[PDB]
């Protein structure tokens, strides 16, 4: 699964290449990565999309389908950050197949 | 203050603490006075503290 404690790597959007830590996960399935933001009217580094509007939903809204946490496969992505106190999860993390 | 601190305190220390905290919560009543210095944190903690000491007093 995806955790806000895991660092992600964009791969499709215009933010392709940027690295950062998740800021929160919504029930809708959208994730906000620390670093992926927009420039408001009064120049305020706040995450959001793009089009004229009023009160609004923050977050750049990224799809899990185009993100890149761990992903064992022939890809261009590299390292990714990840609990430990579990122990059993450490074994899986140690296995090049599980995590 | 944490439960650990209250237990270490003596029977008298818990009484002077409760009386002192009661003193705090009261000056905290400045909420109605619309004071600025006020802070919701300690306001909500004083009621718990006086409660904790009260419960531990019973535990004794």
């Amino acid at each position: 699964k995806i955790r806000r404690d895991d660092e992600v790597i964009v791969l499709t959007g215009k933010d392709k290449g940027k690295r950062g830590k998740v800021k929160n996960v919504l029930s809708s399935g959208k994730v906000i990565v620390e670093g992926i933001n927009l420039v408001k009217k009064h120049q305020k580094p706040v995450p959001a999309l793009n089009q004229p509007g009023g009160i609004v939903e923050k977050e750049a809204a990224i799809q899990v389908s185009n993100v890149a946490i761990f992903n064992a496969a022939t890809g261009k992505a590299d390292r990714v950050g990840f609990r430990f106190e579990d122990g059993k999860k450490v074994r899986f993390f140690k296995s090049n197949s599980e995590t | 203050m944490k439960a650990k601190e209250l237990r270490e305190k003596s029977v008298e220390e818990l009484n002077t603490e409760l009386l002192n905290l009661l003193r705090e919560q009261f000056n905290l009543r400045m909420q109605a006075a619309s004071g600025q210095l006020q802070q919701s944190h300690l306001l909500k903690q004083v009621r718990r503290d006086v409660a904790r000491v009260k419960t531990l007093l019973n535990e004794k």
């Binding site: - | 009661l22 009261f26 000056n27 009543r29 400045m30 909420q31 109605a32 006075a33």
Partner: protein, 92 residues
């Protein structure tokens, strides 16, 4: 002592009083009878009060539409000190 009180008072009304006339406004708890409010005052305030009066107030429902009101306000109490000093600060 430090057990029953709220806001010292408000603007005009609880201001015209305490101006020069020996009288003081202050929001006191509802449960507060007459035992206190002549202690927890006269005790904290550097003075001695004589006559005591505890009021009671409350608004009501309505005010809007297809909503809900059903509530109850709260009540301060006037307490005339005595020929001496007015709390030692607030006032005239």
């Amino acid at each position: 002592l430090l057990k029953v009180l709220r806001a010292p008072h408000v603007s005009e009304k609880a201001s015209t009083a305490m101006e020069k006339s020996n009288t003081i406004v202050l929001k006191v708890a509802k449960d507060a009878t007459k035992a206190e409010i002549k202690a927890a005052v006269q005790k904290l305030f550097e003075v001695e009060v004589e006559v005591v009066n505890t009021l009671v107030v409350k608004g009501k429902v309505k005010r809007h539409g297809q909503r809900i009101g059903r509530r109850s306000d709260w009540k301060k109490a006037y307490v005339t000190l005595k020929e001496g000093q007015n709390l030692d600060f607030v006032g005239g």
